[PDB]
Each structure stands twice: as structure tokens, then as C-alpha cells.
Amino acid sequence: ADDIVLKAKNGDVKFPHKAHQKAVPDCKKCHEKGPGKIEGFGKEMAHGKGCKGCHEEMKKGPTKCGECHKK
Ligand code: HEC
Ligand code: HEC
Ligand code: HEC
Ligand SMILES: C[C@H](CCC(=O)O)[C@H]1CC[C@H]2[C@@H]3CC[C@@H]4C[C@H](O)CC[C@]4(C)[C@H]3C[C@H](O)[C@]12C
Incomplete structure (x- = not known):
């Protein structure tokens, strides 16, 4: 499956799954x-x-705001 982008009005927020699967092995979080x-x-x-x-x-x-949100 593909990553998802949350369409925040101040700037798209990407959610990269692969980095989360690797860094958060407590999947039930x-x-x-x-x-x-x-x-x-x-x-x-x-x-x-x-x-x-x-x-x-x-x-x-x-x-920080601009680390998550990017137009
Ligand atoms: C929240 C920060 C999450 C953590 C920690 C893990 N996953 Fe996840 N998973 C989450 C989202 C929002 C989504 C859907 C959007 C996306 O970007 O893919 C997923 C999806 C999966 C899938 C499907 C991935 C694919 O088919 O490419 C699987 C099998 C799944 N996730 C497994 C999984 C495992 C086993 C995790 C722990 C090691 C893990 N996820 C953590 C959100 C988050
Ligand atoms: C813990 C249960 C988390 C939740 C919920 C969310 N994120 Fe996360 N994120 C987490 C860790 C520990 C890390 C480090 C990954 C690394 O290896 O650097 C991150 C990292 C990101 C990244 C940067 C990814 C990179 O490869 O540098 C982004 C863009 C990110 N996270 C976005 C994001 C958003 C938008 C979330 C809610 C939808 C989210 N994270 C949830 C841990 C956790
Ligand atoms: C990534 C970990 C984030 C950080 C750091 C900040 N924001 Fe954020 N914000 C994030 C997400 C995933 C979302 C979308 C929520 C959803 O409904 O899916 C948002 C949302 C906002 C909004 C609202 C946008 C809208 O409703 O369209 C604004 C105005 C906003 N964020 C501002 C903002 C600022 C100024 C930040 C630094 C103080 C900031 N965000 C940090 C993810 C992340
Ligand atoms: C439930 C976890 C952890 C946060 C918490 O404990 O509430 C949160 C972390 C990231 C969240 C997802 C972010 C992307 C999507 C945002 C949508 O608007 C609602 C569905 C999704 C798929 C969210 C579902 C759920 O709300 C998640 C997976």
C-alpha cells in the first residue's frame, strides 16, 4: 500500500509508513x-x-511546524 498525505490547509503532511514500521516495533501503538x-x-x-x-x-x-507541513 501507498503512503498517505494529510491535506492540512497550511501544508500537506506526509506520513511515511516504512520509517514508522522500523522505528516503532510496538505496532499496537x-x-x-x-x-x-x-x-x-x-x-x-x-x-x-x-x-x-x-x-x-x-x-x-x-x-517543528515546517518539518511536518510542506506545501
Ligand atoms: C502509526 C505511527 C503506525 C505504526 C507505529 C505502524 N503503522 Fe502500520 N500503518 C499505519 C498507517 C496509517 C497505515 C496506512 C497508511 C500507510 O502509509 O500505509 C499502515 C499500514 C500498514 C500495513 C499496510 C502497509 C502496506 O501494505 O504497504 C501493514 C501490514 C502494517 N501497517 C503493519 C504494521 C506493523 C506490523 C507495524 C509494527 C512493526 C506497523 N504497521 C506500525 C500506521 C502505523
Ligand atoms: C509513535 C507511536 C509515532 C506516531 C504515532 C507517529 N510517529 Fe512519526 N515517527 C516516529 C519515530 C520514532 C520516528 C523516527 C523515524 C526515523 O527513523 O527517523 C518518526 C519519524 C517521522 C517522520 C520522518 C521520517 C524519516 O524517515 O525521517 C515523519 C515525516 C513522521 N514521523 C510523520 C508523522 C506523522 C505526520 C504522524 C501522525 C499522522 C506520525 N509521524 C505519527 C514515531 C511516531
Ligand atoms: C507533524 C508531527 C506535525 C507537527 C510538528 C505540526 N503539525 Fe500541524 N498538523 C499535523 C497533521 C497531521 C495535521 C492534519 C490533521 C488532520 O486533520 O488530518 C495538522 C494540522 C494542522 C493545522 C490544521 C489544518 C487544517 O485543518 O486543514 C494547522 C493550522 C497546523 N497543523 C499548524 C501547525 C503549526 C503552525 C505547527 C508548529 C507550531 C504545526 N502544525 C506542527 C502535523 C504536524
Ligand atoms: C491510532 C493511532 C495512534 C494515535 C492514538 O493513539 O490515537 C493514529 C496514528 C496515526 C493515525 C492515522 C493517520 C492517517 C489517517 C488520518 C485520518 O484522518 C484517519 C485515518 C488515519 C489512517 C489515522 C488512523 C489513526 O488515528 C492513527 C493510525
Whole structure:
């Protein structure tokens, strides 16, 4: 399957899966979540534990606005 781009208005956000499969061997951090996670995602999650917060906790991954968002 292909990577996905989140169409944030301030700039597309790429999500590269291969880098996540390799760096986050705890696949249940994202997979096998109960129902609601597709509908639940949005800006609050992305700037929180959905994206940025995990990077902050794992001490690796982009944490600045222009590292995630790129037109
Ligand atoms: C959240 C940060 C995730 C982590 C950690 C892992 N995966 Fe994942 N996976 C996630 C997304 C949003 C998607 C779909 C979008 C995409 O970019 O592909 C996937 C997809 C998969 C698939 C399909 C990949 C493909 O067919 O090319 C598989 C089999 C899957 N993911 C496996 C998987 C494994 C085993 C993980 C841990 C080592 C892993 N993922 C972590 C989000 C995230
Ligand atoms: C932990 C459970 C994570 C979640 C949820 C998300 N990401 Fe992540 N990301 C994680 C790690 C530990 C890393 C390091 C990968 C590396 O080897 O450098 C990253 C990295 C990225 C990258 C940069 C990838 C690269 O090859 O340099 C990007 C662009 C990225 N992550 C984006 C991203 C977004 C948009 C997320 C939510 C949709 C997301 N990450 C979730 C750990 C975790
Ligand atoms: C990657 C880990 C991110 C970092 C660092 C920042 N943002 Fe972000 N933001 C991210 C995602 C995945 C999303 C899309 C959410 C979704 O609904 O899919 C966003 C969203 C925003 C938005 C809202 C855009 C819209 O609703 O169309 C804005 C205005 C935004 N982000 C701004 C922003 C700024 C200024 C940041 C630095 C302070 C920043 N983001 C960091 C992913 C990431
Ligand atoms: C559930 C995990 C981890 C965050 C958390 O614990 O909530 C998060 C991390 C990244 C999230 C995905 C980002 C890309 C997609 C954003 C869409 O708008 C909703 C579906 C997708 C496929 C999201 C589904 C789910 O919300 C995920 C896989």
C-alpha cells in the first residue's frame, strides 16, 4: 500500500509508513486500536499523541511546524 498525505490547509503532511514500521516495533501503538480512531483523528490528535507527541516522547521524529507541513 501507498503512503498517505494529510491535506492540512497550511501544508500537506506526509506520513511515511516504512520509517514508522522500523522505528516503532510496538505496532499496537497504532494498530489494533478499538473503533473510532479513523473518525477521531484531526488536528488535536496530530499535535498531540497522534503524531507530534509520540515524536516528543520517543525523542525522535519531526516536532517543528515546517518539518511536518510542506506545501
Ligand atoms: C502509526 C505511527 C503506525 C505504526 C507505529 C505502524 N503503522 Fe502500520 N500503518 C499505519 C498507517 C496509517 C497505515 C496506512 C497508511 C500507510 O502509509 O500505509 C499502515 C499500514 C500498514 C500495513 C499496510 C502497509 C502496506 O501494505 O504497504 C501493514 C501490514 C502494517 N501497517 C503493519 C504494521 C506493523 C506490523 C507495524 C509494527 C512493526 C506497523 N504497521 C506500525 C500506521 C502505523
Ligand atoms: C509513535 C507511536 C509515532 C506516531 C504515532 C507517529 N510517529 Fe512519526 N515517527 C516516529 C519515530 C520514532 C520516528 C523516527 C523515524 C526515523 O527513523 O527517523 C518518526 C519519524 C517521522 C517522520 C520522518 C521520517 C524519516 O524517515 O525521517 C515523519 C515525516 C513522521 N514521523 C510523520 C508523522 C506523522 C505526520 C504522524 C501522525 C499522522 C506520525 N509521524 C505519527 C514515531 C511516531
Ligand atoms: C507533524 C508531527 C506535525 C507537527 C510538528 C505540526 N503539525 Fe500541524 N498538523 C499535523 C497533521 C497531521 C495535521 C492534519 C490533521 C488532520 O486533520 O488530518 C495538522 C494540522 C494542522 C493545522 C490544521 C489544518 C487544517 O485543518 O486543514 C494547522 C493550522 C497546523 N497543523 C499548524 C501547525 C503549526 C503552525 C505547527 C508548529 C507550531 C504545526 N502544525 C506542527 C502535523 C504536524
Ligand atoms: C491510532 C493511532 C495512534 C494515535 C492514538 O493513539 O490515537 C493514529 C496514528 C496515526 C493515525 C492515522 C493517520 C492517517 C489517517 C488520518 C485520518 O484522518 C484517519 C485515518 C488515519 C489512517 C489515522 C488512523 C489513526 O488515528 C492513527 C493510525
